Amino acid sequence: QKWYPAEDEAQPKKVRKAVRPWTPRKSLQPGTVLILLAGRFRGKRVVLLKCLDQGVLLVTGPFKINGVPLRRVNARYVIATSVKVDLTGVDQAKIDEVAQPKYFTAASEEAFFKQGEKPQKKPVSSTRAADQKAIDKALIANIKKVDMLASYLASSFSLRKGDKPHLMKF
Amino acid sequence: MSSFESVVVIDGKGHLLGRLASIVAKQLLSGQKIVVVRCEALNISGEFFRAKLKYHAYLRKMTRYNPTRGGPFHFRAPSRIFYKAVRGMIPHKTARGAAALERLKVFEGVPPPYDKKKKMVVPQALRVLRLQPGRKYCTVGRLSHEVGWKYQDVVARLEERRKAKGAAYYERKKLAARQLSEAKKAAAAKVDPKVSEALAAYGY
Amino acid sequence: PSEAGHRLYVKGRHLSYQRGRRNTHPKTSLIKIEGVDDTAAANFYLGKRVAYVYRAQKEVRGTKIRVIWGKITRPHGNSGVVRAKFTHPLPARSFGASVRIMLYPSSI
Amino acid sequence: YAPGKAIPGHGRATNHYPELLLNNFKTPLGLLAAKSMHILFPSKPELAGRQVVTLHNQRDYIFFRRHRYVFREARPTEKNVVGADGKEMEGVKGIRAGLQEIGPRMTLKLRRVDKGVGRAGSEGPDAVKWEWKAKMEKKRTRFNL
Amino acid sequence: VRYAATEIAPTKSARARGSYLRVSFKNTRETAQAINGWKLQRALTFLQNVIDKKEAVPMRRYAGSTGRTAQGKQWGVSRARWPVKSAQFLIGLLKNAEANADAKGLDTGNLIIKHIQVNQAPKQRRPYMSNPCHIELILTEAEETVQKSEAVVR
Amino acid sequence: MVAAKKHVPIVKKRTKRFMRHQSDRFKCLDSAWRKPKGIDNRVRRRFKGNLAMPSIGYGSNKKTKHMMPSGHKAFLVHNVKDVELLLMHNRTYAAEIAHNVSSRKRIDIITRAKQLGVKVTNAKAKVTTEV
RNA sequence: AAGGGAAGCGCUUGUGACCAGACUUGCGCCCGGCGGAUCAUCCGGUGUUCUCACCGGUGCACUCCGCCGGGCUCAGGCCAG
RNA sequence: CCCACCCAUACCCCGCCCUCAGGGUAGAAACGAUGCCCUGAGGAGUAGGCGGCCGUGGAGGUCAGUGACGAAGCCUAGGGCGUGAGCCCGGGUCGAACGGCCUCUAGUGCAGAUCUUGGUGGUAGUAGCAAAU
RNA sequence: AACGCGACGAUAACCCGCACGUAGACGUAUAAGAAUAGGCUCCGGCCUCGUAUCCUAGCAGGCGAUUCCUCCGCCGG
């Protein structure tokens, strides 16, 4: 490049490490109900939409049912339930568009005088919204077909006395 | 099976002293609060003459100077006998052992705060489940009474009064069971056969 | 009103360290997880995250709660007791103390 | 510098505007410093909130204190505040003033006054108006105030 | 950082020093500890009573069993004596301190002994060695707590 | 990117000092390590529960040796001549002004090192900022 | 701060108190203007290793540097998943 | 008699330190050939032998070395370096000299010696008012 | 018991100032007695098994309805 090596900084030898497609567990299928265990939505029942790369998953609540918007989740941090809601009617093109990483990725007087102040809670964009709706209309339309599934997704999971996860069948 | 409780109440009737005390000590070191009732109803294997012989040897053990400091204090109360056993099995000279001893409480009879509570049993220490049918056994309360315990009769009348009140409580429990079962049938007469079959299918 | 629980963990007790008869190793701790009594259950609970929560009598981030994190790694013995390794060894007076075993990472 | 928290027997200041006591400023530099502090503080104190902010200047050492009033009668064991060169002031014959420091202790000593916002900002041929110097302070009787 | 508690105002304070005094250091320390933290009049009357054999100074650190009387009840200590020269020189030194405070213009009614320190002095090279002492005591007017004005909303 | 070079992580085998035996109980014994010579001393015999002895095994890695936690090696500097000596190798060494250096020479070392990209461990010894 | 018939020391946390302060955090490219220069087959002077330097004087057609005002990119220290 | 389990500095895998052994290294090296790189082995230790390195007083040379805007010394619930003896810096005090390296030199490194001198404790405000004072 | 306990009598509330908010809870729910070569019962029947029962849904759990008189809690008799 522009500068000739200034010091004896040695280049690293070639690293023989390739990136290969991630293989999710068999329980993870599009439409599986998942149990968020960590984060600000810990203990919450959501629905899986699409499996992303490197262990990431795209889920929704849906928002109108429980309160979880379109978000990413860690497969190791989420528990899969055997119940699988049908995903017919959901736009796969919209699923891909929302699954693109950039969607969730992204000195003056105002800066100097806001220095130190706690930033205000900015509102939700109509695009993140209106896409939440473009998915949830069909998804809840699917939900009302299955009996009590709406209440199941609305309620929050918890462990009771005597409940032993190593024997409990999720 | 491996359950954690706020406090465990153990009815001491029919339990072997050493086995029950060892289990209690292990539970205390694990951090489970344990309280033991009917220490006068505790049981010791062997024969009563063997028990009297050993505890009289313990009485024979005394310090030479004034028996006020460093001398073996012979506590003749059955609860204190159980306490001596658990203390011998507890590292009583360390802070952890002191914490376990503070977590442990032992009583004679069943005061109201624990008679209005549930009592657990330990199968590994039950006399019936542990000792051979032909073997003989003795009572901690009888030993304590014949060595010097003064309040065997006091706990006797208090226990009898508790028996009377518990019998009355059971009678009211019978009446409650009457009403509960009749309500079960009467409600099941119109219990939405669909939901009833749902419960049947799922196993409740 | 929900009137329900918020528990997403399994209770356990830090009991002691990995020790012989007269030699202890604080770097590793022994945990008795509630409800598990067999090596198969311990194998299920292998590789798990662990939190020890305690009070501090002083606020640093607006709270007096402090959490020491660790992991259940491999089972101990045959009674379902498991062995855990933390970033910092558990204090010492936590022998017999309540500990939280999380449900992540999950293989289900 | 000492905080009120560390000050024993202290208190908080209240929201009221306190009055300033600018003591023993005599040279033109002292008048300049005094007027700068007067500009810094409000013109009309809320005398209902009985708070005093005092900057007392002796031997170029400006002393900052903050107290609050109690005008009380003199106790039998107390004195009457005697006058300097004219002792025993006339008119206040049985009344004292109670002071409880409710502000930090700092001592300020002026080192530099400039024309604009610092040396970088003072541009003309009189960029610096005054600078404290050890040659100026060599003699103990020479006070710049 | 942290700030140490600032000293009380010098013109609310009075200081007194006595160096190279020819009284036993242990006795002076015991008397100073007995009279520490008290009212000025209380301390003076206490020391006058000590001279008049009326009230006894209890020994705590440098305690040698000499007297076991009823005068030790008020301190809870079973060992009490009467240091005469100690009481007399300390009376002199608090009188000097009171005169200094009066000169400074303090309220005589409210002097209290915040501080009294007794240290050892260079030994009198005469084997029998004397033990002289240094005594420094710091007095103040009682701390004053004053009213608040009610905060005005705006 | 202004830091030390890529380096092997600094691993310290032992962080606590080696203390002389019985230096706790006798004040006349300084804490500096002195190897005991008693034929029956427990520390020399290396019994359990006794003070450890220094060893080339405790000796540290050569790649991470003499390196500060920031990753630079301390260079004792007395003047701008020493700073110009550090010119070519600032990613290896950090300037440490000598204690006996005067205020203006400290200022010159700091200014030249800042112009030169050389980190100084003590840049706040006898100086202050003026606007 | 601690102290129920010793203290003191070792390994390992925890609590409190005080003290310190992490990578020293930038290069590159592209536009428009401005000024300097191995730029000019420019002029003059000086010292020299006699072929290399350093000054004084003109300019900005080309070339190279900067400074300003834009624009884009990249790289980074530690710790976790 | 049978199954599982617990842990030594014991055995296995890996990282690091040093010593040893072997190999490579010039129309010279991308690191003082007394230098650099690679590989394998080993690691207790009394009497004793060998090497290296830390430190003190003074002398020659050198660092166009530090310094009255602060040398040396000392104190310090601070930041580092070295396995270690030790070295550097920060904060306070302080006031006139001092240090790094290459050598040269020696009255050169302390816990003991019922060690020397000096100073200071418990005994103890005790024993006793005894010579001295 | 001078670091075991009980009953009783008599007290210390105001003014000004100033200082801070768990040897281990997270559903920390569950009372017959008695025997174990017997016991329970509803008098039909039932008992290896607490592997049970109770409770368990809603922003760390909102608003308004729909609709229920079921539980919970506070105070009085």
Tokens of A28: 């993870």
Residues B137 and B71: their CA atoms lie apart, in Å, by 30
DSSP per-residue letters across F7-64? ------S--SPPPPTTTTT-SSS-SS------TT-HHHHT-TTS-----TTT---STT
Q: Which nucleotide is nearest to C34 (CA to C1')?
A: I28
List strand residue ranges (DSSP E) for A5-55, in order.
32-36, 44-51
H or E element in which residue D108 lies: strand D106-108
Looking at residue E139, its amino acid is: L
E–F contact: 3+ Cβ pairs < 8 A: no
H or E element in which residue B84 lies: helix B78-89
Looking at residue B67, its amino acid is: P
Residues E84 and D140: their CA atoms lie apart, in Å, by 48
Handedness of CA B127, B131, B133, B135 (dihedral sign): negative
**Nucleotides of I strand lying within 7 Å of any protein CB atom:** 16-19, 21-37, 41-42, 50-62
| Beta pairing class for D19-23 and D51-58 | parallel
The answer to whether the beta carbon of residue F82 comes closer than 7 angstroms to any atom of strand G is no
What distance in Å separates residue E141's CA from the closest CA in chain D?
Answer: 11
Contacts with A73 (C-beta within 8 Å, 6 or more apart), sequence order: A34, A36, A46, A56, A57, A58, A59
Residues F100 and A108: their CA atoms lie apart, in Å, by 44
- Rg of chain E taking only CA atoms, in angstroms: 19
Query: Coil, strand, or helix at residue B1?
Result: coil
Residues A50 and A42: their CA atoms lie apart, in Å, by 20
Q: Smallest Cβ distance to A76: which of C2, C44, C106?
A: C106
- Paired with E141 in beta bridges are E111
Contacts with F25 (C-beta within 8 Å, 6 or more apart), sequence order: none
Phi, psi (deg, nearest 5) at residue D29: -65, -40
D–E contact: 3+ Cβ pairs < 8 A: yes
Tokens of F35: 């190897």
Tokens of F101: 């250096």
Contacts with E107 (C-beta within 8 Å, 6 or more apart), sequence order: D75, D77, D78, D79, E141
Tokens of F37: 């010579």
Handedness of CA E94, E96, E98, E101 (dihedral sign): negative
What distance in Å separates residue F25's CA from the closest CA in chain A?
Answer: 51
Closest by Cα among A96, A76, A94, A87 to A35 = A76
Closest by Cα among C42, C90, C50, C45 to C70 = C50
Contacts with B154 (C-beta within 8 Å, 6 or more apart), sequence order: none
Q: Which chain D residue shows the shortest CA-CA distance from E105?
A: D79
H or E element in which residue D112 lies: strand D112-114
B113: preceding bond cis by omega (within 30 degrees):
no
Cβ separation of C96 and B30 shorter than 8 Å?
yes
Contact F122, F96 (CB under 8 A): yes
Looking at residue E38, its amino acid is: W
Q: Which nucleotide is nearest to F14 (CA to C1')?
A: H83
**Chains in contact with B, where contact requires at least 3 CB pairs less than 8 Å apart:** C
Other CB atoms within 10 Å distance of the CB of residue F101: 18
Q: Which residue has the tokens 């500990």?
A: C99
Residues C31 and F107: their CA atoms lie apart, in Å, by 58
* C-alpha dist (Å) from residue A150 to A62, A139, D118, F97: 10, 11, 69, 71
Query: Coil, strand, or helix at residue A141?
Result: helix
CA geometry: angle A17, A23, A26, nearest 5 deg: 160
Query: Coil, strand, or helix at residue B96?
Result: helix
Contact E79, E85 (CB under 8 A): no
Q: Which nucleotide is nearest to B38 (CA to C1')?
A: I33
Residues D15 and A130: their CA atoms lie apart, in Å, by 50
DSSP per-residue letters across E44-107? HHHHHHHHTTSS-EEPSSS-------GGGTTTT-S-EE--HHHHHHHHHHHHHHHHHHHHHT--
Tokens of B52: 């009297």
In b/e form, how buried is each residue of F23-37, taking b as 16+ CB within 10 angstroms?
A: beeeeeeeeeeeeee
Cβ separation of F6 and A7 shorter than 8 Å?
no
**Nucleotides of H strand lying within 7 Å of any protein CB atom:** 4-9, 15-18, 30-31, 43-44, 46-47, 64-72, 79-86, 88-91, 111, 120-121, 124-126, 131-133
* C-alpha dist (Å) from residue E142 to B3, D6, D43, E37: 63, 18, 34, 12
List the single best residue of B4, B5, B90, B124 to mutate versus C (max C Cβ within 10 A). B4
Residues F107 and A51: their CA atoms lie apart, in Å, by 60
The answer to whether the beta carbon of residue F43 comes closer than 7 angstroms to any atom of strand G is no
Cβ separation of C15 and B2 shorter than 8 Å?
no
Q: Smallest Cβ distance to A79: which of C4, C36, C108?
A: C108
Q: What is the DSSP letter of C15?
A: E
**Within A 35-94, residues with CB less than 7 Å from strand G:** 54, 74, 76-77
What distance in Å separates residue B161's CA from the closest CA in chain C?
Answer: 39
Contact B52, B121 (CB under 8 A): no
Residues A34 and A84: their CA atoms lie apart, in Å, by 9
Other CB atoms within 10 Å distance of the CB of residue C21: 5
Contact B79, B107 (CB under 8 A): yes
* Sequence-distant contacts of D120-128: CB under 8 A, at least 24 apart: D120/F131
Query: Coil, strand, or helix at residue D62?
Result: strand
Query: Coil, strand, or helix at residue A50?
Result: strand
Tokens of C55: 């009070």
With beta carbons under 8 A apart, name residues in chain F contacting D118. 131
Cβ separation of A77 and C105 shorter than 8 Å?
yes
Cβ separation of C44 and A166 shorter than 8 Å?
yes
DSSP per-residue letters across E2-35? --PPPPPPGGGEEEEEEEEE-S-HHHHHHHHHHH
Query: Coil, strand, or helix at residue A81?
Result: strand
Tokens of E12: 């609310």
List strand residue ranges (DSSP E) for B23-101, in order.
34-37, 43-45
Residues C7 and C102: their CA atoms lie apart, in Å, by 10
* C-alpha dist (Å) from residue B67 to B53, B54, B83: 22, 20, 20
Cβ separation of C96 and B4 shorter than 8 Å?
no
With beta carbons under 8 A apart, name residues in chain E contacting D46. 152
Residue F9: burial class (beta carbons within 10 Å; 0-12, 13-18, 19+): exposed
User: What counts of helices (H) and strands (E) characterise chain A?
Assistant: 5, 5
Contacts with E43 (C-beta within 8 Å, 6 or more apart), sequence order: E35, E94, E113
Closest by Cα among D65, D54, D33 to D132 = D33
Contacts with B64 (C-beta within 8 Å, 6 or more apart), sequence order: none
Residue F24 known to bind ligand: no
Contact F77, F97 (CB under 8 A): yes
Residues B86 and B20: their CA atoms lie apart, in Å, by 9
Handedness of CA F85, F87, F89, F95 (dihedral sign): positive
The answer to whether the beta carbon of residue F47 comes closer than 7 angstroms to any atom of strand G is no
Tokens of A134: 């473009």
Contact A54, A60 (CB under 8 A): no
F7: contact with A, CB 8 A cutoff = no
A62: preceding bond cis by omega (within 30 degrees):
yes
Q: What is the DSSP letter of F110?
A: H
Looking at residue A115, its amino acid is: Q
What distance in Å separates residue F70's CA from the closest CA in chain A?
Answer: 17
Residues E85 and E98: their CA atoms lie apart, in Å, by 20
C105: preceding bond cis by omega (within 30 degrees):
yes
* C-alpha dist (Å) from residue B150 to B56, B59, B75: 17, 17, 12
Closest by Cα among C47, C49, C54 to C90 = C54
Residues C58 and E154: their CA atoms lie apart, in Å, by 35
What distance in Å separates residue D69's CA from the closest CA in chain E?
Answer: 8
- Listed resolution, Å: 3.6
C–E contact: 3+ Cβ pairs < 8 A: no
Looking at residue A84, its amino acid is: K
Closest by Cα among B81, B147, B128 to B108 = B81
Q: Smallest Cβ distance to B30: which of C11, C13, C36?
A: C13
In b/e form, how buried is each residue of A74-91, taking b as 16+ CB within 10 angstroms?
A: bbebbbbbeebbebeebe
Contact B114, B37 (CB under 8 A): yes
- Paired with E62 in beta bridges are none
What distance in Å separates residue B95's CA from the closest CA in chain C?
Answer: 9
- Rg of chain B taking only CA atoms, in angstroms: 23
Contact D25, D15 (CB under 8 A): no
Residues E64 and E75: their CA atoms lie apart, in Å, by 16
Interface of A with C in 39-98 (CB under 8 A): 42-43, 76-80
Q: How many CA atoms lie within 13 A of B176 on its CB side?
A: 6
Residues F56 and B73: their CA atoms lie apart, in Å, by 58
Residues E79 and C81: their CA atoms lie apart, in Å, by 61
Contacts with C82 (C-beta within 8 Å, 6 or more apart), sequence order: C30, C31, C32, C33, C36, C42, C45, C46, C72, C73, C74, C75, C76
H or E element in which residue E141 lies: strand E133-141
Q: Could you tell me what percentage of chain F is helix, strand and coil, using 3-state DSSP and rounding each to the nearest 5?
A: 20, 10, 70
Other CB atoms within 10 Å distance of the CB of residue F65: 10
The answer to whether the beta carbon of residue B174 comes closer than 7 angstroms to any atom of strand I is yes
Cβ separation of C106 and A78 shorter than 8 Å?
yes
Query: Coil, strand, or helix at residue D106?
Result: strand
C1' (G65) to CA (F84) span, angstroms: 25
Closest by Cα among D19, D27, D79, D87 to D51 = D19
Looking at residue E135, its amino acid is: I
Looking at residue C97, its amino acid is: A
CA geometry: angle C73, C77, C83, nearest 5 deg: 25
Tokens of F73: 């090696």
| Beta pairing class for B104-106 and B34-37 | parallel
Residues C36 and C44: their CA atoms lie apart, in Å, by 10
- Paired with C11 in beta bridges are C100
Q: In what order do the strands lie in the sheet with D61-68?
A: D19-23, D51-58, D61-68, D106-108
| Beta pairing class for B137-139 and B43-45 | antiparallel
Tokens of C27: 């770097």
Closest by Cα among C67, C105, C107, C102 to C87 = C67
Tokens of E78: 């079973």
With beta carbons under 8 A apart, name residues in chain A contacting C2. 156
Q: How many CA atoms lie within 13 A of A145 on its CB side?
A: 10
Q: Which nucleotide is nearest to B5 (CA to C1')?
A: I28
Contact D33, D62 (CB under 8 A): yes
With beta carbons under 8 A apart, name residues in chain D contacting F131. 118-120
Residues E110 and D75: their CA atoms lie apart, in Å, by 11
Contact F8, A10 (CB under 8 A): no
Cβ separation of B96 and C13 shorter than 8 Å?
no
H or E element in which residue F94 lies: strand F93-97
The answer to whether the beta carbon of residue E5 comes closer than 7 angstroms to any atom of strand G is no
Q: What is the DSSP letter of F99?
A: T
Closest by Cα among B103, B126, B135 to B24 = B103
Tokens of D63: 């002393």
Query: Coil, strand, or helix at residue B176?
Result: helix
**Nucleotides of G strand lying within 7 Å of any protein CB atom:** 5, 7-29, 75-77, 79, 81
Other CB atoms within 10 Å distance of the CB of residue B55: 19
DSSP per-residue letters across D15-48? SSPPEEEEE---SHHHHHHHHHHHHHS-SS--TT
Tokens of C7: 């528990």
Method: cryo-EM
H or E element in which residue E112 lies: strand E111-120
Residues F43 and F96: their CA atoms lie apart, in Å, by 38
Query: Coil, strand, or helix at residue B186?
Result: helix
User: What counts of helices (H) and strands (E) characterise chain F?
Assistant: 3, 2
Interface of F with D in 111-130 (CB under 8 A): 130
Cα dihedral B17, B18, B24, B26 in deg (nearest 10): 180
A-F contacts (CB, under 8 Å)? 6
Q: Which nucleotide is nearest to F118 (CA to C1')?
A: G24
